[PDB]
């Protein structure tokens, strides 16, 4: 079996992509954020505390004939930004793009943090990391991807995210019309339950490629591209007028600048991020200063190939028993 769904940025900055997901019977369609940096599928529901629900669409497990309570079970998760939700657990039918898993654990938020309440476009998350990151207790639950893999034509999924444009999530096959040349695959470490890999080096603009191992995570659920302080500093020394801003938190540049391109190494292959992708946008509407899309991961603790890097490529997540990550230009 296979699935195909369209994924659309939540705003004109491409901060996040949401994809529709059909949960229960009959189907309630909820717009989820597919996040390769976590492993829970949780959604706003009829259990959610009413003053923390805004404009979101909710799951009501009591209107689904296939819903069952997973008793005993609760979950509580916190994200890189300090945001959080918790609640209890049902199993139910969930379909993406036509691909149907039954007995998928759908985590029901009882409570959600201020940032989730404020985000009217995201009714919850679908985690795509390894299931050893799942928050449900006392037994952890499989992600959608792991439940799907028995029936998939190929145990894979691809991320084809758009720049200011929709894109696609496919499950179970690789669309060979979606990219150009060939996919380079690199090995994935699951030690810390992420899509973790090591890029082989970098170049700024038309300058030389520097062979250097950069271990990071591919994380669809992170907007920007978080690199070690000294690579990011070599990047922004090429845009005159770029400076680090304590106020705003990161490198900022004039919006008028033509930014250079950034290349990152995947094995012997090279993926080039156009410089207009690294122009996140301006730091306030009308402002003449823009925020950069390449920043330090020094206070993170870990390098993150986020949406700005991933949307430059066609990415295959190879979920075989030894997993790998694949990258093609597009």
């Amino acid at each position: 079996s296979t699935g195909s769904a369209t994924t659309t940025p939540i705003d004109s900055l491409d901060d996040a992509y949401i994809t529709p997901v059909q949960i229960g019977t009959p189907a309630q369609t909820l717009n989820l954020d597919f996040d390769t940096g976590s492993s829970d599928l949780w959604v706003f529901s009829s259990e959610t505390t009413a003053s923390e629900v805004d404009g979101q669409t909710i799951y009501t497990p009591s209107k689904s004939t296939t819903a069952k309570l997973l008793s005993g079970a609760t979950w509580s998760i916190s994200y890189g930004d300090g945001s959080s939700s918790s609640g209890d657990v049902y199993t139910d039918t969930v379909s993406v793009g036509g691909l149907t898993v039954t007995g998928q654990a759908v985590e029901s938020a009882k409570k959600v943090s201020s940032s989730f309440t404020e985000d009217s476009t995201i009714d919850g998350l679908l985690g795509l990391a390894f299931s050893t990151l799942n928050t449900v207790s006392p037994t952890q639950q499989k992600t959608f991807f792991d439940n799907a893999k028995a029936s998939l034509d190929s145990p894979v999924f691809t991320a084809d995210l758009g720049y200011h444009a929709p894109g696609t999530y496919n499950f179970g096959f690789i669309d060979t019309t979606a990219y150009t040349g060939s996919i380079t695959y690199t090995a994935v470490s699951t030690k810390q339950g992420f899509w973790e890999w090591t890029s082989t080096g970098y170049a700024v603009g038309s300058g030389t490629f520097k062979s250097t191992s950069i271990d990071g995570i591919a994380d669809t659920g992170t907007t920007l591209l978080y690199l070690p302080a000294t690579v990011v500093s070599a990047y922004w020394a090429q845009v005159s007028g770029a400076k680090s801003s304590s106020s705003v938190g990161g490198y900022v540049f004039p919006c008028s600048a033509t930014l250079p391109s950034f290349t990152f190494g995947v094995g012997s292959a090279r993926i080039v991020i156009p410089g207009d992708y690294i122009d996140f946008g301006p730091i306030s509407t009308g402002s003449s200063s823009c925020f950069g899309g390449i920043q330090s991961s020094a206070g993170i603790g870990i390098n993150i190939f986020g949406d700005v890097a991933l949307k430059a490529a066609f990415v295959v997540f190879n979920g075989a028993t030894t997993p790998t990550l694949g990258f093609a230009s597009k």
């Binding site: 900055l13 901060d15 996040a16 954020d33 996040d35 940096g37 976590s38 492993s39 829970d40 998760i77 916190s78 994200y79 890189g80 930004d81 945001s83 998350l125 985690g127 990391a129 990151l133 928050t135 992420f194 995570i217 994380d219 659920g221 992170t222 907007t223 920007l224 996140f280 870990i302 993150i304």
Partner: peptide
Amino acid sequence: XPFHLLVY
């Protein structure tokens, strides 16, 4: 603004 949804 920008999102950091790795789990931490």
